[PDB]
Assembly symmetry: C4
Homo-oligomer: 102 residues x 4
């Protein structure tokens, strides 16, 4: 029941481009590296890993999932300061492009 | 006694419009779209279903509530990337409107 | 051992004022209301209430506490949208006032 | 495998300085002061104390951890109003800093 959101959302406002939305490329790489780490450090599934990844850089909220090891705990810190920005402007560009599509 | 807040709040300062507080229009569809999905897919009650919809762009904090299913995990990201922006400019506009209200 | 922060922070950086940090006054008033509601509605203690209040507009996070009543649930939803933007500007002005203190 | 984030990130793009990233200095001192507080009050392991301390500036989300003493509740509000904006301006400068590195 989400075909509306996926297609008329975070694939629709992507095909709307300047140059400082090369930040969505940066986010992809910090998000993917994070997902690769949480799967392997923390033993979680990919979807749970991509959930937690995104959860540390948006107001979303981690569910049960949170790190348990020092290595993942620190990584979350290092990652957390780097992604917080790439999310903030991707959310802003993406938000305007909703109101520009109305 | 929530009256003071609902009435001197999300209704009072909601009626200050430029052209760019049609973000509130964009938001209400997106919060609602999310709430239908959460009620139907996640099985939850309207209030709690809305409570999670509003939680993924705001520093409120989602309840015991977190998505348990994959679609509701996937969807929460796609929705969350888009709304986080829509929540912010609205939130600033309303706050802006409280200060020049006294 | 908070006597450091409270004097060298919360009562330090406020003693610096423009026009727009009348925003502190509105946030002050919003939070006190919110706390009274939670103490009265949600039965929680004055700090537990005051903690949740501040929880909902900044990223910090509420540990155990989440509203259990439909009435307090909506109160947080309405109160959430108002307070968040006031949190931004008071939190931003107050942080710049650290930087102009070093 | 955190090395790629640690070195190709939170030190690699940490060392792009204007005048206005003296906040990173200010961050170090206030994040440190909190961690020392959390280690001492909350009994917690320094890492977990540094996990909570950062959790409250960023969209991270504190693990199972939260202030359970009143003073640590009283401290966290005072410190969250101060440190949030510092995590914001550095969050963007480091964000801008990944994009400028393409
Ligand atoms: C006189 C005014 C003329 C300019 C009109 C306005 C166009 C501005 C271009 C901005 O950048 C564009 O956006 C995409 C990304 O930035 C590129 O897409 C694509 O670019 C390549 C084109 O093949 C593909 O390989 C890539 O996958 C994909 O990013 C595209 O090419 C590139 O130009
Ligand atoms: C009337 C005469 C006035 C004198 C002129 C004053 C302004 C000169 C600006 C020179 O630029 C500098 O370049 C460094 C490159 O980033 C900066 O970081 C430097 O400063 C750090 C602080 O010491 C060093 O530790 C680091 O090595 C180093 O990166 C430094 O802050 C910055 O000022
Ligand atoms: Ca959380
Ligand atoms: Ca939230
Ligand atoms: Ca957080």
């Amino acid at each position: 029941t989400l075909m509306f959101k996926r297609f008329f959302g975070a694939v629709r406002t992507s095909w709307r481009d300047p140059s400082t939305r090369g930040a969505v490329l940066s986010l992809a790489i910090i998000v993917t590296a994070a997902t690769i780490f949480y799967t392997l450090a923390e033993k979680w599934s990919v979807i749970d890993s991509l959930f937690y990844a995104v959860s540390v850089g948006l107001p979303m909220g981690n569910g049960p999932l949170s790190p348990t090891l020092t290595l993942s705990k620190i990584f979350t810190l290092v990652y957390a300061i780097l992604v917080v920005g790439l999310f903030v402007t991707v959310g802003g560009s993406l938000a305007s492009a909703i109101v520009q599509n109305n």
